[PDB]
Amino acid sequence: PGGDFSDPVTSATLGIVQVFWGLDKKLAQRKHFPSVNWLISYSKYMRALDEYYDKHFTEFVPLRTKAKEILQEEEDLAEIVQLVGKASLAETDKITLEVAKLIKDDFLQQNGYTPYDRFCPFYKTVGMLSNMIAFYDMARRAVETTAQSDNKITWSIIREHMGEILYKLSSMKFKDPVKDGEAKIKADYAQLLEDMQNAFRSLE
Amino acid sequence: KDRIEIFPSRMAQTIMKARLKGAQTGRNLLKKKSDALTLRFRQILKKIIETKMLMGEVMREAAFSLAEAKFTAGDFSTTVIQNVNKAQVKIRAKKDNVAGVTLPVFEHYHEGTDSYELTGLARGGEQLAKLKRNYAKAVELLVELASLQTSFVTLDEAIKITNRRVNAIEHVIIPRIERTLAYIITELDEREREEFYRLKKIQEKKKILKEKS
Amino acid sequence: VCLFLNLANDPTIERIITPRLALTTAEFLAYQCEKHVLVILTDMSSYAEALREVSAAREEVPGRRGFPGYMYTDLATIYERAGRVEGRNGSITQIPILTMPNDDITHPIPDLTGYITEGQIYVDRQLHNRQIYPPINVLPSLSRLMKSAIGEGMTRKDHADVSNQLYACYAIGKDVQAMKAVVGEEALTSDDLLYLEFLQKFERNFIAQGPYENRTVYETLDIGWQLLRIFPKEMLKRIPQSTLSEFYPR
Amino acid sequence: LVQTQRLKIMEYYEKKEKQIEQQKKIQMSNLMNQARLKVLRARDDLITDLLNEAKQRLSKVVKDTTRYQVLLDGLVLQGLYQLLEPRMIVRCRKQDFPLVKAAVQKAIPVYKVATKRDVDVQIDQEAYLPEEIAGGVEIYNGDRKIKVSNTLESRLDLIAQQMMPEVRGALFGANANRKFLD
């Protein structure tokens, strides 16, 4: 009756089912479409699927462990980002608000009538997260080894320098999975990784 | 003013338990954001009286040079008030925040003009530069005192607003959400009690139907 | 282990004789065969949803929050089947498990469990989202008989003084954890950095275990000491000085 | 860094070596588990065949008559005391009609001195107990709505299940760890 777990029907379903694709009404006017919450939504089929992911895909569970965490560290920052407002902040937190923003508009963002976002194949789904987590860990490894030595950097020297890298990392959701070939999409995500391994070596 | 308008139900109990809990998290920010601003507010008072005692020194040691131009050059005050066009020290403003509120702080600047490079060319100009060094490192101090009393009155106004906003939750908002909670747990005890009797009364009417048979 | 599995699609009367089959087996095994039995009752809030269903299908009238009026002396017939006994070498220690609906504590299933049982454990949600296993909160949790299960000749001599020292430094860090966001990193001293560097290693080494790593209690103190070496001996206030001389320098 | 590129490969082959050694203990645990079950089934088979010998030694008494007429005095009067209806009806086998009838006739006065009741108890000559049973009777009430199974196969089933602690204590020894009984 308005999005609660107090009524006897919603609370006595979550004691029975294993997947909860928890949707809210506050997170609907963003034109996000779905209204995914990803804080109260769970899935208890992660232990049963540790054999399918490790055999057929063999890489995905540590990226899924990290990608659920980056969207969680953003939440416990965002109450202070509203009230205090980005003034005296660490620079490892500015990664997990800009890389975390890149997930929330280019990975968990959909629109269902479009010729690229009515089907999302899973090899392209792990192909998009294979680059986004690599950009997060390379932004973290840059900011922690260049924290004391000489010419300490922030994020705001990278996003101005690497603005063309953040276009290819934002134009993965707009590649059509239907017209393009099956292997036409992984090579584009494997050629982009060397435009993400060489690009950081242009700053250091 | 005494209750937030809602009617007692099971769902409306969890929403006024969440809004109370969603207010206690706001006060927990503002209870310590004021003290974090008060943590910087004591240190400016732990700087302003210490800087004021250096002000009593520099205006003596440079004031012990005021004779060291006047025992030598006599009176030269008609030079400094009739021969001046452009000063040397400039002031540029700089913002430098603490904890969500900004603080405008004064910064030194070095213009490159002086209308006093040929002063003392007749009798002596070496004793003037002894005073001139002694007064310039007063302005190299008094730009820090003038920046310290201007970050005082920015943290003096931002603390006296946050408090009126921790107290506006402690004494206005959160007691109103608590008193409507103590009315939902009361009026729903009443709706269970009137349905205690009604579920009991239909049971005796089933017993009247069974002793007939 | 002797496993009693009562399903959800099985009858709701068979859920009410399930913890009574398990506790009569435990009272044979302990008070007549002198074993030490640990009795784990999983989801005791699902017992009380089957007791409320069996009660209303017995044509009884419900009590407070719809639960039966005898709910205090119905859980007590389950929970109070515990403890050691005089003249026998066995015991029964119970670990109930609850599911609080809407994280409510004034619900009558956690209200009466906290009314008969001694302490709580408090699996936390803000640790499960941050990917910590097991997600057990320390700050609200409590064992009311913990001061008798520890000590010399039971666990080890410093188990009292280590635990309340890690409890203080977990609380002082979590204030610094929120305070760091308010003022920033450049405004924290070399005191509030020892508590945020401990806090990154208390959650990922003491709390974090992994599901197959049986840390014995002699190894949960050496874990607990090599976090207490991030601080010098001038900072550890909860530990008395006699065992600080015996356990800190290694 | 030559140290570092060993360990990132070593962690891919300490992880595989922690895996199969876990896979070794699953095989040893799945076989020790069915070890206790296969030996618990070889304790159940010895019991369910001990009752088969008590089902065949039971039918070596129904061949007798001087030891079975005195038994059928028990089983009928045990049923006429359970029902206590003013008109009961006794079922039996085909060839066991006189041993039931001579047990009924000795019972109705012995009933009446013990209960102060009157009965019209008569033997059903239309429907028989099936001959594959091992003896005994069944006593109905007047309109055959409450029945008492006092056959010998349903008496051995009731007796033996309430003697299963005692036959276990005598066959397989005492419990080596059970100190008390209360």
Side-chain angles (χ1 to χ4, degrees), chain B residues 10 13-14 17 29 32-33 36 39 99-100 192 196 199-200 203 206, chain C residues 59 61-66 101-102 104 106-107 175 178-179 182-183:
Chain B
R10 188 62 189 95
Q13 186 183 0
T14 68
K17 281 165 88 78
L29 271 166
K32 71 193 164 215
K33 189 191 154 191
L39 191 56
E192 198 87 32
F196 175 84
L199 297 170
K200 178 165 187 187
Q203 290 314 120
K206 199 175 180 184
Chain C
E59 210 175 347
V61 167
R64 313 187 52 218
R65 206 72 74 87
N102 210 39
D104 210 9
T106 64
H107 193 241
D175 170 45
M179 167 60 156
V182 170
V183 307

PDB file of all heavy atoms in Angstrom, chain B residues 10 13-14 17 29 32-33 36 39 99-100 192 196 199-200 203 206, chain C residues 59 61-66 101-102 104 106-107 175 178-179 182-183:
ATOM      1  N   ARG B  10      -1.325   0.251  10.776  1.00  0.00           N
ATOM      2  CA  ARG B  10      -0.042  -0.426  10.889  1.00  0.00           C
ATOM      3  C   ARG B  10       1.012   0.188   9.982  1.00  0.00           C
ATOM      4  O   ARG B  10       2.166   0.321  10.395  1.00  0.00           O
ATOM      5  CB  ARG B  10      -0.200  -1.912  10.578  1.00  0.00           C
ATOM      6  CG  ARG B  10       1.046  -2.715  10.860  1.00  0.00           C
ATOM      7  CD  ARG B  10       1.402  -2.643  12.329  1.00  0.00           C
ATOM      8  NE  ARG B  10       2.712  -3.225  12.593  1.00  0.00           N
ATOM      9  CZ  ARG B  10       3.834  -2.519  12.667  1.00  0.00           C
ATOM     10  NH1 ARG B  10       3.797  -1.207  12.511  1.00  0.00           N
ATOM     11  NH2 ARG B  10       4.988  -3.121  12.910  1.00  0.00           N
ATOM     12  N   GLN B  13       2.329   3.531  11.238  1.00  0.00           N
ATOM     13  CA  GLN B  13       3.235   3.446  12.375  1.00  0.00           C
ATOM     14  C   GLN B  13       4.678   3.336  11.913  1.00  0.00           C
ATOM     15  O   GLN B  13       5.578   3.905  12.536  1.00  0.00           O
ATOM     16  CB  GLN B  13       2.858   2.258  13.252  1.00  0.00           C
ATOM     17  CG  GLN B  13       3.653   2.162  14.528  1.00  0.00           C
ATOM     18  CD  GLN B  13       3.290   0.946  15.322  1.00  0.00           C
ATOM     19  OE1 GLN B  13       2.432   0.161  14.913  1.00  0.00           O
ATOM     20  NE2 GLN B  13       3.935   0.774  16.470  1.00  0.00           N
ATOM     21  N   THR B  14       4.920   2.620  10.815  1.00  0.00           N
ATOM     22  CA  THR B  14       6.282   2.478  10.317  1.00  0.00           C
ATOM     23  C   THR B  14       6.776   3.735   9.617  1.00  0.00           C
ATOM     24  O   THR B  14       7.986   3.948   9.525  1.00  0.00           O
ATOM     25  CB  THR B  14       6.376   1.302   9.352  1.00  0.00           C
ATOM     26  OG1 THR B  14       5.648   1.610   8.161  1.00  0.00           O
ATOM     27  CG2 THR B  14       5.772   0.071   9.982  1.00  0.00           C
ATOM     28  N   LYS B  17       7.761   5.981  12.397  1.00  0.00           N
ATOM     29  CA  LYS B  17       8.985   5.494  13.013  1.00  0.00           C
ATOM     30  C   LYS B  17      10.189   5.742  12.129  1.00  0.00           C
ATOM     31  O   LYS B  17      11.298   5.891  12.647  1.00  0.00           O
ATOM     32  CB  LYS B  17       8.897   4.000  13.323  1.00  0.00           C
ATOM     33  CG  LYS B  17       8.129   3.662  14.569  1.00  0.00           C
ATOM     34  CD  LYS B  17       7.781   2.190  14.593  1.00  0.00           C
ATOM     35  CE  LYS B  17       8.881   1.370  15.222  1.00  0.00           C
ATOM     36  NZ  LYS B  17       8.833   1.478  16.704  1.00  0.00           N
ATOM     37  N   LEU B  29      24.123  14.528  12.307  1.00  0.00           N
ATOM     38  CA  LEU B  29      25.012  15.358  11.503  1.00  0.00           C
ATOM     39  C   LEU B  29      25.180  16.733  12.127  1.00  0.00           C
ATOM     40  O   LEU B  29      26.297  17.157  12.440  1.00  0.00           O
ATOM     41  CB  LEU B  29      24.463  15.499  10.086  1.00  0.00           C
ATOM     42  CG  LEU B  29      24.835  14.481   9.023  1.00  0.00           C
ATOM     43  CD1 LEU B  29      23.911  14.639   7.841  1.00  0.00           C
ATOM     44  CD2 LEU B  29      26.273  14.715   8.602  1.00  0.00           C
ATOM     45  N   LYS B  32      27.144  17.354  15.436  1.00  0.00           N
ATOM     46  CA  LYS B  32      28.597  17.330  15.370  1.00  0.00           C
ATOM     47  C   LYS B  32      29.165  18.273  14.322  1.00  0.00           C
ATOM     48  O   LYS B  32      30.347  18.621  14.411  1.00  0.00           O
ATOM     49  CB  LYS B  32      29.103  15.902  15.110  1.00  0.00           C
ATOM     50  CG  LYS B  32      28.841  15.357  13.718  1.00  0.00           C
ATOM     51  CD  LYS B  32      29.092  13.852  13.680  1.00  0.00           C
ATOM     52  CE  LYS B  32      28.475  13.192  12.455  1.00  0.00           C
ATOM     53  NZ  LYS B  32      27.971  11.829  12.763  1.00  0.00           N
ATOM     54  N   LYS B  33      28.364  18.700  13.342  1.00  0.00           N
ATOM     55  CA  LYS B  33      28.838  19.710  12.403  1.00  0.00           C
ATOM     56  C   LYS B  33      29.011  21.050  13.096  1.00  0.00           C
ATOM     57  O   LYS B  33      29.937  21.801  12.781  1.00  0.00           O
ATOM     58  CB  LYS B  33      27.881  19.846  11.222  1.00  0.00           C
ATOM     59  CG  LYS B  33      28.433  20.716  10.100  1.00  0.00           C
ATOM     60  CD  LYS B  33      27.387  21.062   9.069  1.00  0.00           C
ATOM     61  CE  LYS B  33      27.739  22.347   8.377  1.00  0.00           C
ATOM     62  NZ  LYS B  33      26.630  22.854   7.546  1.00  0.00           N
ATOM     63  N   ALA B  36      32.216  20.513  15.090  1.00  0.00           N
ATOM     64  CA  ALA B  36      33.348  20.562  14.171  1.00  0.00           C
ATOM     65  C   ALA B  36      33.639  21.990  13.737  1.00  0.00           C
ATOM     66  O   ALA B  36      34.796  22.352  13.508  1.00  0.00           O
ATOM     67  CB  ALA B  36      33.070  19.688  12.956  1.00  0.00           C
ATOM     68  N   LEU B  39      35.135  23.321  16.778  1.00  0.00           N
ATOM     69  CA  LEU B  39      36.519  22.884  16.888  1.00  0.00           C
ATOM     70  C   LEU B  39      37.464  23.838  16.172  1.00  0.00           C
ATOM     71  O   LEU B  39      38.561  24.106  16.669  1.00  0.00           O
ATOM     72  CB  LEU B  39      36.673  21.471  16.331  1.00  0.00           C
ATOM     73  CG  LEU B  39      38.002  20.779  16.609  1.00  0.00           C
ATOM     74  CD1 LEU B  39      38.277  20.734  18.096  1.00  0.00           C
ATOM     75  CD2 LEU B  39      38.000  19.380  16.028  1.00  0.00           C
ATOM     76  N   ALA B  99      34.152  22.741   6.554  1.00  0.00           N
ATOM     77  CA  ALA B  99      32.970  21.931   6.875  1.00  0.00           C
ATOM     78  C   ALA B  99      31.676  22.494   6.290  1.00  0.00           C
ATOM     79  O   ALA B  99      30.704  22.698   7.013  1.00  0.00           O
ATOM     80  CB  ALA B  99      32.821  21.732   8.386  1.00  0.00           C
ATOM     81  N   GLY B 100      31.650  22.752   4.985  1.00  0.00           N
ATOM     82  CA  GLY B 100      30.434  23.110   4.290  1.00  0.00           C
ATOM     83  C   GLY B 100      30.159  24.596   4.193  1.00  0.00           C
ATOM     84  O   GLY B 100      29.509  25.032   3.238  1.00  0.00           O
ATOM     85  N   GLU B 192      -7.725  -2.855  18.293  1.00  0.00           N
ATOM     86  CA  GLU B 192      -7.623  -4.273  18.581  1.00  0.00           C
ATOM     87  C   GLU B 192      -8.625  -4.688  19.639  1.00  0.00           C
ATOM     88  O   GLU B 192      -9.172  -5.793  19.563  1.00  0.00           O
ATOM     89  CB  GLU B 192      -6.210  -4.617  19.035  1.00  0.00           C
ATOM     90  CG  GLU B 192      -5.873  -6.090  18.954  1.00  0.00           C
ATOM     91  CD  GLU B 192      -5.342  -6.501  17.599  1.00  0.00           C
ATOM     92  OE1 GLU B 192      -4.679  -5.671  16.945  1.00  0.00           O
ATOM     93  OE2 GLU B 192      -5.583  -7.657  17.189  1.00  0.00           O
ATOM     94  N   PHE B 196     -11.396  -7.289  19.612  1.00  0.00           N
ATOM     95  CA  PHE B 196     -11.324  -8.417  20.533  1.00  0.00           C
ATOM     96  C   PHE B 196     -12.720  -8.904  20.872  1.00  0.00           C
ATOM     97  O   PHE B 196     -13.005 -10.103  20.805  1.00  0.00           O
ATOM     98  CB  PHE B 196     -10.566  -8.013  21.800  1.00  0.00           C
ATOM     99  CG  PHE B 196     -10.541  -9.070  22.878  1.00  0.00           C
ATOM    100  CD1 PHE B 196      -9.597 -10.073  22.852  1.00  0.00           C
ATOM    101  CD2 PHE B 196     -11.427  -9.028  23.940  1.00  0.00           C
ATOM    102  CE1 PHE B 196      -9.559 -11.029  23.837  1.00  0.00           C
ATOM    103  CE2 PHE B 196     -11.396  -9.987  24.926  1.00  0.00           C
ATOM    104  CZ  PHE B 196     -10.460 -10.984  24.874  1.00  0.00           C
ATOM    105  N   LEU B 199     -14.878 -10.391  17.626  1.00  0.00           N
ATOM    106  CA  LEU B 199     -14.534 -11.770  17.311  1.00  0.00           C
ATOM    107  C   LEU B 199     -14.929 -12.728  18.419  1.00  0.00           C
ATOM    108  O   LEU B 199     -15.078 -13.925  18.173  1.00  0.00           O
ATOM    109  CB  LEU B 199     -13.037 -11.901  17.043  1.00  0.00           C
ATOM    110  CG  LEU B 199     -12.504 -11.129  15.848  1.00  0.00           C
ATOM    111  CD1 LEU B 199     -10.993 -11.179  15.875  1.00  0.00           C
ATOM    112  CD2 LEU B 199     -13.055 -11.690  14.551  1.00  0.00           C
ATOM    113  N   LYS B 200     -15.091 -12.230  19.642  1.00  0.00           N
ATOM    114  CA  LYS B 200     -15.596 -13.077  20.710  1.00  0.00           C
ATOM    115  C   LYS B 200     -17.111 -13.213  20.636  1.00  0.00           C
ATOM    116  O   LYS B 200     -17.644 -14.301  20.869  1.00  0.00           O
ATOM    117  CB  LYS B 200     -15.167 -12.518  22.066  1.00  0.00           C
ATOM    118  CG  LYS B 200     -15.695 -13.302  23.246  1.00  0.00           C
ATOM    119  CD  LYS B 200     -14.981 -12.974  24.530  1.00  0.00           C
ATOM    120  CE  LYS B 200     -15.439 -13.908  25.627  1.00  0.00           C
ATOM    121  NZ  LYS B 200     -14.896 -13.518  26.945  1.00  0.00           N
ATOM    122  N   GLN B 203     -18.495 -15.794  18.406  1.00  0.00           N
ATOM    123  CA  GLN B 203     -18.242 -17.160  18.836  1.00  0.00           C
ATOM    124  C   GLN B 203     -19.351 -17.699  19.714  1.00  0.00           C
ATOM    125  O   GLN B 203     -19.703 -18.874  19.588  1.00  0.00           O
ATOM    126  CB  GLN B 203     -16.917 -17.260  19.588  1.00  0.00           C
ATOM    127  CG  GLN B 203     -15.699 -17.085  18.707  1.00  0.00           C
ATOM    128  CD  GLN B 203     -15.788 -17.895  17.441  1.00  0.00           C
ATOM    129  OE1 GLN B 203     -15.768 -17.352  16.337  1.00  0.00           O
ATOM    130  NE2 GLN B 203     -15.903 -19.207  17.590  1.00  0.00           N
ATOM    131  N   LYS B 206     -22.211 -18.733  17.693  1.00  0.00           N
ATOM    132  CA  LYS B 206     -22.044 -20.058  17.114  1.00  0.00           C
ATOM    133  C   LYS B 206     -22.347 -21.137  18.147  1.00  0.00           C
ATOM    134  O   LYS B 206     -22.760 -22.246  17.795  1.00  0.00           O
ATOM    135  CB  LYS B 206     -20.623 -20.207  16.575  1.00  0.00           C
ATOM    136  CG  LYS B 206     -20.448 -21.319  15.565  1.00  0.00           C
ATOM    137  CD  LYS B 206     -19.047 -21.321  15.000  1.00  0.00           C
ATOM    138  CE  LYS B 206     -18.871 -22.437  13.993  1.00  0.00           C
ATOM    139  NZ  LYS B 206     -17.466 -22.504  13.514  1.00  0.00           N
TER     140      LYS B 206
ATOM    141  N   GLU C  59      -9.637 -22.007  16.858  1.00  0.00           N
ATOM    142  CA  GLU C  59     -10.756 -21.140  17.223  1.00  0.00           C
ATOM    143  C   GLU C  59     -10.494 -20.435  18.557  1.00  0.00           C
ATOM    144  O   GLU C  59     -11.335 -20.405  19.454  1.00  0.00           O
ATOM    145  CB  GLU C  59     -12.075 -21.920  17.229  1.00  0.00           C
ATOM    146  CG  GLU C  59     -13.309 -21.127  16.888  1.00  0.00           C
ATOM    147  CD  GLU C  59     -14.541 -22.008  16.792  1.00  0.00           C
ATOM    148  OE1 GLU C  59     -14.387 -23.248  16.753  1.00  0.00           O
ATOM    149  OE2 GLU C  59     -15.661 -21.460  16.777  1.00  0.00           O
ATOM    150  N   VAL C  61      -9.011 -16.619  20.262  1.00  0.00           N
ATOM    151  CA  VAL C  61      -9.083 -15.192  19.971  1.00  0.00           C
ATOM    152  C   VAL C  61      -7.682 -14.623  20.164  1.00  0.00           C
ATOM    153  O   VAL C  61      -7.026 -14.934  21.167  1.00  0.00           O
ATOM    154  CB  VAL C  61     -10.143 -14.520  20.862  1.00  0.00           C
ATOM    155  CG1 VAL C  61     -10.043 -13.023  20.823  1.00  0.00           C
ATOM    156  CG2 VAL C  61     -11.526 -14.952  20.421  1.00  0.00           C
ATOM    157  N   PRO C  62      -7.168 -13.830  19.225  1.00  0.00           N
ATOM    158  CA  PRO C  62      -5.770 -13.397  19.305  1.00  0.00           C
ATOM    159  C   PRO C  62      -5.531 -12.365  20.394  1.00  0.00           C
ATOM    160  O   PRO C  62      -6.463 -11.753  20.921  1.00  0.00           O
ATOM    161  CB  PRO C  62      -5.513 -12.795  17.919  1.00  0.00           C
ATOM    162  CG  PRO C  62      -6.622 -13.279  17.062  1.00  0.00           C
ATOM    163  CD  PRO C  62      -7.787 -13.424  17.955  1.00  0.00           C
ATOM    164  N   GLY C  63      -4.259 -12.183  20.735  1.00  0.00           N
ATOM    165  CA  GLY C  63      -3.869 -11.182  21.709  1.00  0.00           C
ATOM    166  C   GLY C  63      -3.169  -9.997  21.081  1.00  0.00           C
ATOM    167  O   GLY C  63      -3.579  -9.524  20.019  1.00  0.00           O
ATOM    168  N   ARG C  64      -2.105  -9.519  21.722  1.00  0.00           N
ATOM    169  CA  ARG C  64      -1.424  -8.313  21.271  1.00  0.00           C
ATOM    170  C   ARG C  64      -0.648  -8.573  19.989  1.00  0.00           C
ATOM    171  O   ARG C  64       0.109  -9.543  19.906  1.00  0.00           O
ATOM    172  CB  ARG C  64      -0.481  -7.815  22.358  1.00  0.00           C
ATOM    173  CG  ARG C  64      -1.096  -7.769  23.750  1.00  0.00           C
ATOM    174  CD  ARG C  64      -0.138  -7.110  24.725  1.00  0.00           C
ATOM    175  NE  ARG C  64       0.311  -5.817  24.223  1.00  0.00           N
ATOM    176  CZ  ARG C  64       1.543  -5.350  24.363  1.00  0.00           C
ATOM    177  NH1 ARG C  64       2.454  -6.069  24.992  1.00  0.00           N
ATOM    178  NH2 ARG C  64       1.861  -4.162  23.878  1.00  0.00           N
ATOM    179  N   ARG C  65      -0.841  -7.702  18.992  1.00  0.00           N
ATOM    180  CA  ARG C  65      -0.305  -7.788  17.628  1.00  0.00           C
ATOM    181  C   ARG C  65      -0.734  -9.077  16.921  1.00  0.00           C
ATOM    182  O   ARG C  65      -0.049  -9.552  16.012  1.00  0.00           O
ATOM    183  CB  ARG C  65       1.228  -7.616  17.613  1.00  0.00           C
ATOM    184  CG  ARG C  65       1.873  -7.082  16.308  1.00  0.00           C
ATOM    185  CD  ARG C  65       1.597  -5.612  16.041  1.00  0.00           C
ATOM    186  NE  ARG C  65       2.371  -4.743  16.925  1.00  0.00           N
ATOM    187  CZ  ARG C  65       3.605  -4.321  16.663  1.00  0.00           C
ATOM    188  NH1 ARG C  65       4.206  -4.690  15.541  1.00  0.00           N
ATOM    189  NH2 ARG C  65       4.235  -3.535  17.521  1.00  0.00           N
ATOM    190  N   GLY C  66      -1.867  -9.667  17.312  1.00  0.00           N
ATOM    191  CA  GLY C  66      -2.400 -10.854  16.690  1.00  0.00           C
ATOM    192  C   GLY C  66      -1.808 -12.153  17.201  1.00  0.00           C
ATOM    193  O   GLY C  66      -2.382 -13.220  16.964  1.00  0.00           O
ATOM    194  N   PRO C 101      10.938  -8.242  11.599  1.00  0.00           N
ATOM    195  CA  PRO C 101      10.233  -7.644  10.458  1.00  0.00           C
ATOM    196  C   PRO C 101      10.373  -6.130  10.478  1.00  0.00           C
ATOM    197  O   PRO C 101      10.144  -5.490  11.507  1.00  0.00           O
ATOM    198  CB  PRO C 101       8.782  -8.087  10.664  1.00  0.00           C
ATOM    199  CG  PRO C 101       8.664  -8.338  12.130  1.00  0.00           C
ATOM    200  CD  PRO C 101      10.016  -8.760  12.624  1.00  0.00           C
ATOM    201  N   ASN C 102      10.806  -5.577   9.340  1.00  0.00           N
ATOM    202  CA  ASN C 102      11.054  -4.142   9.139  1.00  0.00           C
ATOM    203  C   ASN C 102      12.106  -3.588  10.104  1.00  0.00           C
ATOM    204  O   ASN C 102      12.078  -2.401  10.440  1.00  0.00           O
ATOM    205  CB  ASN C 102       9.754  -3.330   9.231  1.00  0.00           C
ATOM    206  CG  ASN C 102       9.776  -2.098   8.371  1.00  0.00           C
ATOM    207  OD1 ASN C 102      10.289  -2.108   7.252  1.00  0.00           O
ATOM    208  ND2 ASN C 102       9.217  -1.016   8.893  1.00  0.00           N
ATOM    209  N   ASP C 104      12.325  -4.030  13.180  1.00  0.00           N
ATOM    210  CA  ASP C 104      11.683  -3.590  14.405  1.00  0.00           C
ATOM    211  C   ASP C 104      12.172  -4.425  15.577  1.00  0.00           C
ATOM    212  O   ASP C 104      12.339  -5.643  15.476  1.00  0.00           O
ATOM    213  CB  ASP C 104      10.160  -3.688  14.287  1.00  0.00           C
ATOM    214  CG  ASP C 104       9.435  -2.647  15.135  1.00  0.00           C
ATOM    215  OD1 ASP C 104      10.103  -1.747  15.687  1.00  0.00           O
ATOM    216  OD2 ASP C 104       8.195  -2.729  15.246  1.00  0.00           O
ATOM    217  N   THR C 106      10.651  -3.670  18.782  1.00  0.00           N
ATOM    218  CA  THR C 106       9.490  -3.739  19.655  1.00  0.00           C
ATOM    219  C   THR C 106       8.434  -4.711  19.159  1.00  0.00           C
ATOM    220  O   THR C 106       7.359  -4.781  19.762  1.00  0.00           O
ATOM    221  CB  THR C 106       8.879  -2.353  19.811  1.00  0.00           C
ATOM    222  OG1 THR C 106       8.386  -1.905  18.544  1.00  0.00           O
ATOM    223  CG2 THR C 106       9.930  -1.389  20.298  1.00  0.00           C
ATOM    224  N   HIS C 107       8.701  -5.422  18.068  1.00  0.00           N
ATOM    225  CA  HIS C 107       7.854  -6.517  17.635  1.00  0.00           C
ATOM    226  C   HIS C 107       7.854  -7.607  18.705  1.00  0.00           C
ATOM    227  O   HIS C 107       8.883  -7.857  19.329  1.00  0.00           O
ATOM    228  CB  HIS C 107       8.375  -7.068  16.313  1.00  0.00           C
ATOM    229  CG  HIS C 107       7.425  -7.978  15.613  1.00  0.00           C
ATOM    230  ND1 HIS C 107       7.729  -9.290  15.330  1.00  0.00           N
ATOM    231  CD2 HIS C 107       6.189  -7.762  15.111  1.00  0.00           C
ATOM    232  CE1 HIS C 107       6.712  -9.849  14.703  1.00  0.00           C
ATOM    233  NE2 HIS C 107       5.763  -8.944  14.560  1.00  0.00           N
ATOM    234  N   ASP C 175      33.145   7.099  15.405  1.00  0.00           N
ATOM    235  CA  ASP C 175      32.876   8.529  15.467  1.00  0.00           C
ATOM    236  C   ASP C 175      33.813   9.298  14.547  1.00  0.00           C
ATOM    237  O   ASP C 175      33.388  10.245  13.880  1.00  0.00           O
ATOM    238  CB  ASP C 175      33.003   9.040  16.895  1.00  0.00           C
ATOM    239  CG  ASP C 175      32.968  10.547  16.971  1.00  0.00           C
ATOM    240  OD1 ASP C 175      32.100  11.153  16.313  1.00  0.00           O
ATOM    241  OD2 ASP C 175      33.803  11.132  17.690  1.00  0.00           O
ATOM    242  N   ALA C 178      32.657   9.050  10.867  1.00  0.00           N
ATOM    243  CA  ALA C 178      31.683  10.033  10.409  1.00  0.00           C
ATOM    244  C   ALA C 178      32.265  11.441  10.430  1.00  0.00           C
ATOM    245  O   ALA C 178      31.959  12.255   9.552  1.00  0.00           O
ATOM    246  CB  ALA C 178      30.426   9.960  11.267  1.00  0.00           C
ATOM    247  N   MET C 179      33.103  11.744  11.428  1.00  0.00           N
ATOM    248  CA  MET C 179      33.710  13.064  11.565  1.00  0.00           C
ATOM    249  C   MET C 179      34.652  13.389  10.412  1.00  0.00           C
ATOM    250  O   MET C 179      34.712  14.555  10.002  1.00  0.00           O
ATOM    251  CB  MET C 179      34.443  13.146  12.911  1.00  0.00           C
ATOM    252  CG  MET C 179      35.398  14.306  13.118  1.00  0.00           C
ATOM    253  SD  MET C 179      34.600  15.908  12.985  1.00  0.00           S
ATOM    254  CE  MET C 179      35.707  16.927  13.950  1.00  0.00           C
ATOM    255  N   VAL C 182      32.920  15.075   7.606  1.00  0.00           N
ATOM    256  CA  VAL C 182      32.467  16.433   7.897  1.00  0.00           C
ATOM    257  C   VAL C 182      33.584  17.451   7.701  1.00  0.00           C
ATOM    258  O   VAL C 182      33.373  18.503   7.092  1.00  0.00           O
ATOM    259  CB  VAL C 182      31.875  16.484   9.326  1.00  0.00           C
ATOM    260  CG1 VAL C 182      31.618  17.898   9.777  1.00  0.00           C
ATOM    261  CG2 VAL C 182      30.575  15.723   9.370  1.00  0.00           C
ATOM    262  N   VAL C 183      34.800  17.151   8.167  1.00  0.00           N
ATOM    263  CA  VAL C 183      35.895  18.116   8.140  1.00  0.00           C
ATOM    264  C   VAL C 183      36.946  17.807   7.090  1.00  0.00           C
ATOM    265  O   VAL C 183      37.727  18.697   6.740  1.00  0.00           O
ATOM    266  CB  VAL C 183      36.569  18.235   9.517  1.00  0.00           C
ATOM    267  CG1 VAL C 183      35.545  18.509  10.546  1.00  0.00           C
ATOM    268  CG2 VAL C 183      37.327  16.969   9.870  1.00  0.00           C
TER     269      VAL C 183
END
